[PDB]
Amino acid sequence: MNKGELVDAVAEKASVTKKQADAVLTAALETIIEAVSSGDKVTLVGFGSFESRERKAREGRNPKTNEKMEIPATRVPAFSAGKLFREKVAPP
Amino acid sequence: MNKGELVDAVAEKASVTKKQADAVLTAALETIIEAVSSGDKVTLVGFGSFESRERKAREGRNPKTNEKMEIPATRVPAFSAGKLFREKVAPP
């Protein structure tokens, strides 16, 4: 399922137009990105939570030259699945 | 940031009412879960992608008894962060 196919179902479920369903979904996804980036954890009950996970430098290897290198420290987006999400994917 | 706080920001950005922002967001998240559960991968450009992943059985240990046990195989919700998410969290 891509964004467009999701919008169709959302516009159907929420009884709104596809242009509206997209505009809201766009806003929702952009806001989650902004919030996480600003170091804020985004929690959505049932579904899950988003946060930034810190990551220190690690050793790596150049596949073309076999030469060892250091992959620099960085910040990554993370996701934790809520109870309802994990239970729909794997019922107790 | 919780759902309610996300709704407010979404309703502000998309120029819609809070009830409408919530109705869409609920539908969007509930659809995402049903799709992942039925074995479909949900891809959203910029943001990221959701999918199920199967974990094989592994050896574990009971902290209450010290007794070694086997954690059974399962399926879990997973997330891949898209380029735009990873770049707002850590700009190149």
Add this chain to the structure above:
DNA sequence: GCATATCAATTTGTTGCAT
């Protein structure tokens, strides 16, 4: 979140293309 086990199995990214 917190905790056992001298745990055990994930996930990713490394460069530079390619689909």
Add this chain to the structure above:
DNA sequence: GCATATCAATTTGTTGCAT
């Protein structure tokens, strides 16, 4: 995605409890 390293810093879950 593919092409290394007998990679390497990382997540996550055992059974429950604490907040």
